[PDB]
Enzyme design. Structure first.
Site, PDB file in Angstrom:
ATOM      1  N   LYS A   1     -12.162  -1.222   6.370  1.00 47.20           N
ATOM      2  CA  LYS A   1     -11.324  -2.180   7.089  1.00 47.20           C
ATOM      3  C   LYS A   1     -11.665  -2.280   8.583  1.00 47.20           C
ATOM      4  CE  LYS A   1      -8.542  -2.635   3.329  1.00 47.20           C
ATOM      5  NZ  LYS A   1      -7.229  -1.923   3.430  1.00 47.20           N
TER       6      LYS A   1
ATOM      7  N   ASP B   1      -1.622   6.730   6.058  1.00 50.34           N
ATOM      8  CA  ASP B   1      -2.727   5.883   5.689  1.00 50.34           C
ATOM      9  C   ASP B   1      -3.056   4.926   6.840  1.00 50.34           C
ATOM     10  OD1 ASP B   1      -4.529   4.057   4.586  1.00 50.34           O
ATOM     11  OD2 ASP B   1      -3.222   3.598   2.848  1.00 50.34           O
TER      12      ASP B   1
ATOM     13  N   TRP C   1       0.826  -1.187   0.000  1.00 46.50           N
ATOM     14  CA  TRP C   1       0.000   0.000   0.000  1.00 46.50           C
ATOM     15  C   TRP C   1       0.874   1.255   0.000  1.00 46.50           C
ATOM     16  CZ3 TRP C   1      -4.462  -0.963  -1.914  1.00 46.50           C
ATOM     17  CH2 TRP C   1      -5.150  -2.145  -1.602  1.00 46.50           C
TER      18      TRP C   1
END
Ligand SMILES: [Ca+2]
Ligand SMILES: [Ca+2]
Lengths: 331, 330
Positions: B173, B149, B77
Site C-alpha cells: 500500500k 495494522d 479490515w
C-alpha cells in the site's frame, strides 16, 4: 564473465534479464506453467508469497484431515526439516531411506519404502540441494497413497507425471529464479479438509478462490522455457551439464564426490578436494576468475556447484576448465 | 501522464522507478528504523506475504496462556482480522462505530471497554475501504499490549512506536512493493508463540535466523529520507488531503460521509449526488488518465487512494477533472 553457482537465491536466465531490460504478464503465467508441465485439469495451481518452507506446515495443515500420522522420507537436510516442522501437527512415521551402495551415499528405491496404512499422505524431497542426492523414480503406489513432494530445487528441469501426485510444491527461488514466490500444484479432491485453525494464507481451499513482480519474472521465465523447447529440451541440456561436471570430478583423483550414480543430483553438485587444505585458495582463485558462490554449506563443508536451468553449458565449462587447471597447478 | 488511485496494489514513487531503471538489503532495515525512530528494544522483521498473514500471526505469537484478546471493529479490515482471530481465541469485540454530526466516526480511545484478561488490544488505524482513520496516539497503561495494522498509513506520518507492542504493515500500500510485510515487535513479547504456529509466522524463529521487493523498499526508504523524512511526508499528505476533501466539501455534486476527525488522509471515498452518473465518471476519468477510482464493490461509489507515492500534481489533476465533470454534468 561472472557465473554464480549459488543454490539459493539462484541466477536468472541471461535472456529473461535482457527481456526484462528492454520492456522497462498476469494470468498467462499460470497457463504457461500448466502447459510446460502438462498439468491435468483436475489439478489446481496456486501462486502464493513466501518460500517453500511455508509448505512444511501447509501440507499437514491441509491434508491431515482427521488423521494424526503421515509418512515422511528422510534422505537429507530438507526432508529432515519438513519432518521437524510436521511434528507440530502430527506424529510423522519416518522412513529412513539412506543406504550405502558401492561405498557411496544412496537412497532406497520406492518399492522398499515401508508405508503405514494410517498415513494421511507420503512426503519426500526428490532433490536435496546440500546433500546432492536426488530421487528420480516416478511414484507408482496404489490409489490409496497420497504422494506429496518438495520440488523446490528441481521443478521445470525434467518432464513430470503430475497425475502420480497429490501435492507438488516448489519455492520459486531455486530453479525458476524470482524469490518470494511459491507454487503449489494440488489434486482438487484433496481440497476441503484443512484444519479449522489453519491460517487463511496457508489454506489451499481459501486461496483457491481469491500479483507481485516475482509473478512477472516467472512469467518471462516460463516463456523463455517454452521458447527453448520446454522441459524436454531443458532435460537434455541439464543432462549434458551434469555429465560434464561429474565427468571431470570422477576422472580426477584430486576432486571427490561420494553419491551413488543413480542418486546424483543434476542440479546441485557437491564435491570435496582430496587435499582439504587447498579449500581456501580454491575459493579465492575461483572467485577471482568469475566463478561465484562455490563454498559448500557449513553443515557439510567442501564445495558445491548448483547448475540450474538458468546456468548455461558455457558456465559449467568455465568451472570445469578452471578445476582442471587448478589441479594441474596444485596437484 | 497517468495517475493510478488504486488502494492496493499501489503506485511506486517516480524517482524510485528511475533509480530502479538503472540498472543493499541490510541498510533497508536500518533506514526503516531511522525513518520512524524505532527504539532499540523493538525487533523489525521483513517477511514474505501480505498483511493478511498477520491476522493469524498476531494471535499465534501473542495469546500466550490467555484465550481472549480485545479487537476494535470500526471497518472492513478490522472485521477481517476479527474473523481470522476466531480460529485462535474468543475475541472481545469493541464496536467503536458511532455517528457524529450525521457522519461516520469512531469512539475515542478512552471509551474503549478493555478486558483485564485480554492478551492484547488490536485496532486498524486506517481503513482503506471505509476511508476512516484513527489518528489518536495510544496511551493505555503499561499493562495493555497494543497491536495495529498500519498497512495503509505506515511512513505517512511520525509515530510513537514506544506506545505499541506490535505494528505490522503489508508493503503493497504505502511503501509500494507487493510481497513484503514488515513487523515491528517489542522484544519482551517474543518467546511465547503457540507451539503449533507455523515457523514462517513465528516471530521468535524469524528473529533467530532476500527478495526483490526488499531492494525496492530500500530505494523507497532512501527516497523518503531525501524528502526530509516522515515529517516532510506528513506535511505533503496533509496538503493533498486538504485539496481533495476541500473540493469534495465545496461541491453539492460530490459527497463524503466521514466525520472530519476520522477522515483518512490516504483513502478518500466519495459518492456522486446523482449516482446514476457513476459509469460516465469512470469512463471519462479513466480516459483522462485517472486510473482505478471505482469504490469497492460493497460500498459502491468512488475511491481515491493518495499514498506517499502519489504527488500533489496527481491529486490536482483528479480535482481539476472532478470540477470539469461537475461543470459538464451538474
Ligand atoms: Ca574424483
Ligand atoms: Ca460535497
Amino acid at each position: 564473465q561472472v557465473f554464480n553457482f549459488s543454490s539459493g537465491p539462484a541466477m536468472l536466465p541471461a535472456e529473461v534479464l535482457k527481456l526484462a531490460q528492454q520492456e522497462l504478464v498476469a494470468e498467462e503465467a499460470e497457463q504457461d506453467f500448466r502447459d510446460l508441465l502438462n498439468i491435468p485439469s483436475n489439478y489446481k495451481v496456486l501462486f502464493c508469497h513466501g518460500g517453500g518452507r511455508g509448505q512444511f506446515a501447509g501440507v499437514p495443515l491441509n491434508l491431515l484431515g482427521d488423521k494424526t500420522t503421515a509418512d515422511y522420507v528422510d534422505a537429507g537436510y530438507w526432508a529432515a526439516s519438513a519432518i521437524k516442522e510436521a511434528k507440530k501437527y502430527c506424529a510423522p512415521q519416518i522412513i529412513d531411506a539412506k543406504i550405502t551402495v558401492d561405498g557411496k551415499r544412496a537412497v532406497k528405491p520406492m518399492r522398499e519404502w515401508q508405508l503405514s496404512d494410517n498415513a494421511a499422505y507420503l512426503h519426500y524431497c526428490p532433490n536435496e540441494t546440500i546433500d546432492g542426492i536426488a530421487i528420480d523414480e516416478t511414484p507408482d503406489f496404489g490409489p490409496e497413497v497420497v504422494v506429496t513432494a518438495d520440488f523446490s530445487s528441481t521443478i521445470l528441469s525434467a518432464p513430470l507425471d503430475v497425475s502420480r501426485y497429490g501435492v507438488i510444491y516448489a519455492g520459486a527461488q531455486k530453479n525458476i529464479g524470482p524469490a518470494g514466490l511459491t507454487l503449489v500444484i494440488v489434486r482438487e479432491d484433496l481440497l476441503g479438509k484443512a484444519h479449522e485453525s489453519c491460517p487463511s494464507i496457508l489454506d489451499y481451499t481459501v486461496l483457491n478462490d481469491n500479483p507481485t513482480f516475482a509473478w512477472y519474472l516467472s512469467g518471462l521465465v516460463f516463456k523463455w522455457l517454452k521458447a527453448q523447447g520446454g522441459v524436454a529440451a531443458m532435460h537434455k541440456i541439464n543432462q549434458q551439464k551434469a555429465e560434464l561436471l561429474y565427468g571431470v570430478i570422477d576422472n580426477s583423483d584430486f576432486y571427490r564426490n561420494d553419491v551413488a550414480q543413480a542418486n546424483r543430483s543434476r542440479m546441485n553438485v557437491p564435491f570435496q578436494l582430496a587435499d582439504n587444505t587447498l579449500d581456501k585458495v580454491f575459493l579465492e582463485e575461483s572467485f577471482a576468475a568469475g566463478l561465484h558462490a562455490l563454498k559448500g554449506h557449513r553443515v557439510v563443508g567442501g564445495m558445491r556447484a548448483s547448475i540450474y536451468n538458468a546456468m548455461p553449458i558455457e558456465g559449467v565449462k568455465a568451472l570445469t576448465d578452471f578445476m582442471i587447471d587448478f589441479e594441474r597447478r596444485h596437484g
